[PDB]
Ligand binder design. Structure first.
Ligand code: HDD
Ligand code: HDD
Lengths: 698, 698
């Protein structure tokens, strides 16, 4: 393999333009040089427009398969064939930020899946939140413009924390339910692998008998739904803007393929109007206590892209992409979406975008669509229209798999309006807030407090405080004292207190206790205990977690026993924000050095403040106890394992200390077991509920 | 003013698509609706390709004027007319990051100026660093591809901290001088208003007699050159990705128009070959001790854009844009640049980009260039070529202002090579490192340590450690112990120790002692001393600085005397990273509350760790002393003003405490004077030189 031009001509150098030159005097570059001009020309034109929304995203290849046929709901083979595996490509994303914006901002997350079925491409373009800000697609530009950077100065980037966003939220009550979800932990996921996915809009399924059902699609992570805490999310946005992209790529490269269960909520054609809300209103969820989610399949992502740009950047999804057996509903948000995903591709990619490798279906494509810019397909023949004398490219009958258009009855008048039930805008916002656990409510309170603090206009946060009273009077008061304004004492939208299942993240734990893919920092310094170090390192690896050694330097660290190791990173190059938990082995000399290292002390205090599991043995126990300096947090004093607020310690290490079985469960006996259990729980919320984080500086 | 379509037809609503609907049943949306389709279509196509490099940037309008004619060097009126003011638009930017990437990343900064002269548009497309990574433009794709996110996974965003960047740096020795500048504080400026600008390439100036001079252009900030510290820059990248954009916009909106002195280095045509280095080598600076910078003008930015997208996003600069009296040289980096700025616009904007308002010249444009997409110009006439029978649009003679092409002698052979002097690649890298102050060397050491730590390939950082020995043997050893690898004991490129002027940032202080535009946080809590508060607030404002009140809540805080104030932000919504210094007034109740507030304690510790000025009076003195907990940092014990490492205190406030004159100078007598002096010094470097920051957790 040797360097050539794009037209196949080998070149002797990639370092010099053709110019006039002499040993002692350089001259002008020549216009004739085709190799140099081509290099610069290709470079000059590398960029294409970013997606107008969901510009920042990461994707991977995988497979989908139903383990239970849904033939009673649809005759689409992708959802009825339990023997075939359907290839997919999934792209996750944020919404407001441009291409280089951070992964860990507060925002809705896109969850788009392209199913390459034998019957054509089916795209399920969803989000990680089940509802949306608006009911009619015509207002998408309004809500997006309001959330995006303000027009005059293009500030702020990838943030809803500014005047215009909250101005729109208050003035468009349809969005009430949505901004409540937006302030919840759902908007700051720990990993794209640890969040749900939803079709959001109401679609339809048609079976072999021609019977139709209205449906909602769900994706549920087998690792459970987990989130970051705000201070941590902001730091990561700067310290590692690719945190989620790397998290996904790393897991797949390591063989830890993320999985999601695929579920369907179905309402018979005949019961369309049997609910308080309109089942086609995208600002409404279908309470699972009324319509249960039926899980029938599983999807896993098992292969990273070969090259990001031609695959992840160029992939195009659209709600318009449905296969036989799957259809649309009169959902006024979905109706307009269908128009958009085709239209936008014309300028983003080009009219022949379906020819791009990543977008092409895996089955035969036959029609008379022709030409268009950058056309690769060459079609032989003298005819390109139907009907024609050769009966070339005839339509497919229904029995041959032709798309079935449900003959839905339609009656009414042409008008710019929605039906009666669409007028209800507060009930579910209250239901959602009511269903949140105490810690989740606290996180939402902190979110409103931070967001409205960043609103400079007293009219904006002042009005929002008034709106919050329509969700919960107590919430309004708390926010008012935090950001200003006056919380009303009454409301025309009383909150009756009802709650519902499967909304709180507490109802989505991992399929089984695990710490798979979690990152655990092992903090050391010269003189560390090689014993505790070896035990933890092996146990972390053996439980599919990632051990990351952090030391004062990234060259060599010497253990108390003389053995050495080269850490993955030094204390200044990484931060606790980048890991799930920290472990510090003993070693008097090591503990003393770390106790005088400000950066090291911060690692401990920040890990504590961010509610992460902390484990320490031997002399490191006093290190941690003194670093945190909280009487509420107790530690081991002898050879007994001790746990307090997710802080696991063992002061006196004995021969049996690391011989106990490693059981990831409540009330484990051994040190590693209890430490891993704290990690498996993700974060220690009691630490925050008891205000201990507020006492620490991090 | 009422809502209309783009074709002028008034509409009754922007909330509903035209559909089939009835009171109780919603129906499908109609295809016929032109208003809705237009809304979505315009939205779907809002984005255009981002700039291939310098995609993230901010700009403003301003004016330029020479106060000293350079008629001896050029006959270009823009540089000789001392009575006219030339309008300009300036766009600042980073280089590697995409559009939504953070402002405060470590990177070269773009400093592009478009001069709208009466003789045509002249663009000076420079950077905030005087040299570049390569000597020949043909390699721009190589260095840019190496620094940009790696192709397989598109990681990392806006960072040179990864394998490929350092792989190229080591393998292309021409870049040695440049990466040294890249690791200096120049790459992490505190504000776009506090950095220099350079043309980088060698241009030429031609005077009325036809005599030519080779030149270098310089921009020097009147506010001085100041930088952030790494931990702070990373936090800001996440906490406020628009930090620099907001800093620039705010200053201009407040009337604090940033100014730069414009200077020129000139070498007579006859002395082109009288230096050790080739004066056309862009990897070389012209030592100011050999060729002095002659300042002749001033530029100020005094007006923010009306709308970001059509102005800042669409503005196009190019080195090709030169006016009569200004020309090009055979600088092999400049030669290729000329080709690029025209080429890239074809896909980024469109062939008619010069028609866009922001790009149009302010003088008459007359030629036979025609048509092209989105053509607005309408030209009457039956002729569009020259020569023609009407002698329409004839050329301008030299006396009429026609562009003067210097008849430069050229002799040599056609070849892909550079001349002899271009082969020197290490001398100036050493000179630069040698010229840095102790603190600047320490910051560079920390930079290499952080950057190479983030290189996963032992071959990459291992080789770089070897390369560093070619700059300074001691530097290599220090980095080797920090990141790994083996520092060589010898080198074929000995560092002789010579230094030069005007390289260290210490040689670029503000024109006069000042704190103009600086932000000062005033931290309070219920029970604060209204006296110290009032005094500081007025003094900050009266010295053109910005007082930002930070409290436990953003609703109302009550002073010890019963008066109240609504802070700008609460402690959780902001961080010390966002301000230049902090001041805490007394009040026993306030100091006690803040002493138990972890977030508040962090504000103090972080401000200290980031080397920022800290001021406190009364009970707040003990608050600060205890928060920092360092014996090295002494504080006032009586009614005397005390200063220690930029920490200014006054424990016992007396009637005369705030009646002393406010003198921003070394050894001021009053509290505000010494506090403001600490602020004016930007940061307290002794704090870091003595390792005090290393003892604090922040
Ligand atoms: C009619 C306009 C409209 C409406 C009402 C929505 N969107 Fe949309 N969306 C677009 C118009 C759009 C778009 C402008 O056409 C985009 C960006 C560019 C592109 O390819 O598609 C897009 C992309 C886009 C993506 C990214 C696909 C990728 O990774 O490329 C996701 C996940 C969604 N949308 C999700 C949703 C959800 C869950 C919605 C609410 C039910 C929604 N969109 C309403
Ligand atoms: C031949 C290729 C090439 C070379 C050798 C350089 N650049 Fe360049 N630069 C481009 C090709 C380019 C470009 C690809 O044409 C860009 C981005 C898109 C655009 O409009 O111009 C650009 C933009 C661009 C901008 C942004 C203008 C704006 O704000 O829009 C600045 C400040 C510079 N460059 C500065 C420099 C400096 C100081 C260089 C070294 C002496 C340099 N460039 C070498």
């Amino acid at each position: 393999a040797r360097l050539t031009t794009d037209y196949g001509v080998k070149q002797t150098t990639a370092d010099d333009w053709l110019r006039i030159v002499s040993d002692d005097k350089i001259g002008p570059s020549l216009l004739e040089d085709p190799f140099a001009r081509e290099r610069i020309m290709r470079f000059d034109h590398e960029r294409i427009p970013e997606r107008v929304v969901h510009a920042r995203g990461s994707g991977a290849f995988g497979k989908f398969k139903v383990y239970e046929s849904a033939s009673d709901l649809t005759m689409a083979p992708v959802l009825t064939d339990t023997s075939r595996e359907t290839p997919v490509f999934v792209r996750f994303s944020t919404v407001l930020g441009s291409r280089g914006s951070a992964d860990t901002v507060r925002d809705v997350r896109g969850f788009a899946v392209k199913f390459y079925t034998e019957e054509g491409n089916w795209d399920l373009v969803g989000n990680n939140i089940p509802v949306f800000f608006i009911q009619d697609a015509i207002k998408f530009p309004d809500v997006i413009h309001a959330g995006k950077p303000e027009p005059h100065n293009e500030v702020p980037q990838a943030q809803s924390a500014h005047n215009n966003f909250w101005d729109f939220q208050f003035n468009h009550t349809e969005a009430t339910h949505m901004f409540t979800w937006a302030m919840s932990d759902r908007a700051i996921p720990r990993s794209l692998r640890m969040m749900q996915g939803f079709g959001v809009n109401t679609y339809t399924l048609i079976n072999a008998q021609g019977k139709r059902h209205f449906v909602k699609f769900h994706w549920t992570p087998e690792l459970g739904v987990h989130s970051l805490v705000w201070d941590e999310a902001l730091k990561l946005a700067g310290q590692d803007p690719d945190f989620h992209r790397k998290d996904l790529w790393e897991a797949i490269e390591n063989g830890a393929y993320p999985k999601w269960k695929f579920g369907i909520q179905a309402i018979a054609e005949e019961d369309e109007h049997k609910f308080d809300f309109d089942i086609l209103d995208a600002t409404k969820i279908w309470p699972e206590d009324l319509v249960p989610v039926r899980y029938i399949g599983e999807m896993e992502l098992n292969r990273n892209p070969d090259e990001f740009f031609p695959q992840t950047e160029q992939i195009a999804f659209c709600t318009s992409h449905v296969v036989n057996g799957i259809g649309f509903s009169d959902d006024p948000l979905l109706q307009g979406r269908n128009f958009s995903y085709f239209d936008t591709q014309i300028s983003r990619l080009g009219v022949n975008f379906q020819e791009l490798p990543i977008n092409r279906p895996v089955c035969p494509v036959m029609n008379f669509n022709r030409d268009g810019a950058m056309r690769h397909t060459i079609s032989r023949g003298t005819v390109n229209y139907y009907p024609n004398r050769f009966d070339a490219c005839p339509p497919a009958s229904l029995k041959e798999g032709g798309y079935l258009e449900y003959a839905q009855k339609v009656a009414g008048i042409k008008a710019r309006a929605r039906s009666a039930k669409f007028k209800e805008h507060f009930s579910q916002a209250q239901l959602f807030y009511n269903s949140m656990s105490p810690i989740e409510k606290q996180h939402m309170i902190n979110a409103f407090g931070f967001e409205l603090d960043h609103c400079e206009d007293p009219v904006v946060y002042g009005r929002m405080v008034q709106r919050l009273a329509d969700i919960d009077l107590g919430l309004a008061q708390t926010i008012a004292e935090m950001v200003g304004g006056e919380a009303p004492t009454t409301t025309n939208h009383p909150n009756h207190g009802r709650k519902t299942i499967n909304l709180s993240q507490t109802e989505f734990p991992p399929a089984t206790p695990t710490i798979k893919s979690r990152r655990v920092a092992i903090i050391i310094a010269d003189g560390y205990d090689n014993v505790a170090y070896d035990a933890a390192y092996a146990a972390i690896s053996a439980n599919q977690a990632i051990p990351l050694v952090i030391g004062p330097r990234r060259s060599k660290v010497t253990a108390a026993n003389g053995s050495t190791v080269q850490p993955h990173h030094h204390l200044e190059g990484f931060r606790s924000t980048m890991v799930d938990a920290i472990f510090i082995p003993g070693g008097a000399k090591a503990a003393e050095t770390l106790s005088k290292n400000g950066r090291a002390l911060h690692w401990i205090r920040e890990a504590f403040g961010h509610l992460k599991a902390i484990g320490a043995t031997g002399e490191a126990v006093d290190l941690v106890a003194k670093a945190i300096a909280l009487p509420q947090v107790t530690v081991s004093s002898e050879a007994e394992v001790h746990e307090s607020y997710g802080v696991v310690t063992l002061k006196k290490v004995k021969p049996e200390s690391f011989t106990d079985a490693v059981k990831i469960a409540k009330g484990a006996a051994g040190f590693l077991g209890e430490f891993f259990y704290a990690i498996a729980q993700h974060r220690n919320w009691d630490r925050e509920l008891d205000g201990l984080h507020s006492m620490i500086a991090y």
